[PDB]
Write an enzyme that holds these catalytic residues in place. Structure first.
Site: not given
Length: 198
Positions: A36, A143, A159
């Site tokens: 992401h 992250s 995550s």
């Protein structure tokens, strides 16, 4: 730049994430991180300089990616712990109940234990399955960062988690924390990567 787990890097001069682990793919240098954090071909920078680009990623569903670095980068078998380092010695997966820590640009080096496995996170973009849960606290920006045991066994990359209004879940009891990481093993085999160890 020197590639160390937990340090900050920017994506397309915008978002900021944390380095997971130094890896190699044949003669190619790189580092694993969260999917992401960037789209394929996105430019990664450290210390204001371009260090590489996102070679591949899977997010949502999974939450993994690796950044292909220029040959000028310096790969290191380490993760940041304050001003010191934790040596990456392998990738043996720890069992539920084991102590574990993570390194990120926002909360630094945080430790706790592994509380559950195969957890599904329902993110804005969709579900991400198979995540491992810990009660170590984390915050936005961590992250992609390294999850590793004190013995140097790399576990995965950051995550997500149930962050509060202050951007982290360090302000609530460990019993109420859900910090989730993407397992390292599937990332390594997915992209044919070898962990840089010491």
């Amino acid at each position: 730049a020197n590639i160390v787990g937990g340090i900050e890097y920017s994506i397309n001069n915008a978002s900021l994430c944390s380095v997971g682990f130094s890896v190699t793919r044949g003669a190619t240098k790189g580092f694993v991180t969260a999917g992401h954090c960037g789209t394929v071909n996105a430019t990664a920078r450290i210390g204001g300089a371009v260090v590489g680009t996102f070679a591949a990623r899977v997010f949502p569903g999974n939450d993994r990616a690796w950044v292909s670095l220029t040959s000028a980068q310096t790969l290191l078998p380490r993760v940041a712990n304050g001003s010191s380092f934790v040596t990456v010695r392998g990738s043996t997966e720890a069992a539920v109940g084991a102590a574990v820590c993570h390194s990120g640009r926002t909360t630094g080096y945080q430790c706790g234990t592994i509380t559950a496995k195969n957890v599904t996170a329902n993110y804005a973009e969709g579900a991400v399955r198979g995540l491992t849960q810990s009660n170590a606290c984390m915050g936005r920006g961590d992250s992609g960062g390294s999850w590793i045991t004190s013995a140097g066994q790399a576990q995965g990359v950051m995550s997500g988690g149930n962050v509060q209004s202050n951007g982290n879940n360090c302000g609530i009891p460990a019993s109420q924390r859900s910090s989730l990481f993407e397992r390292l093993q599937p990332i390594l085999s997915q992209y044919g990567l070898s962990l840089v160890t010491g």
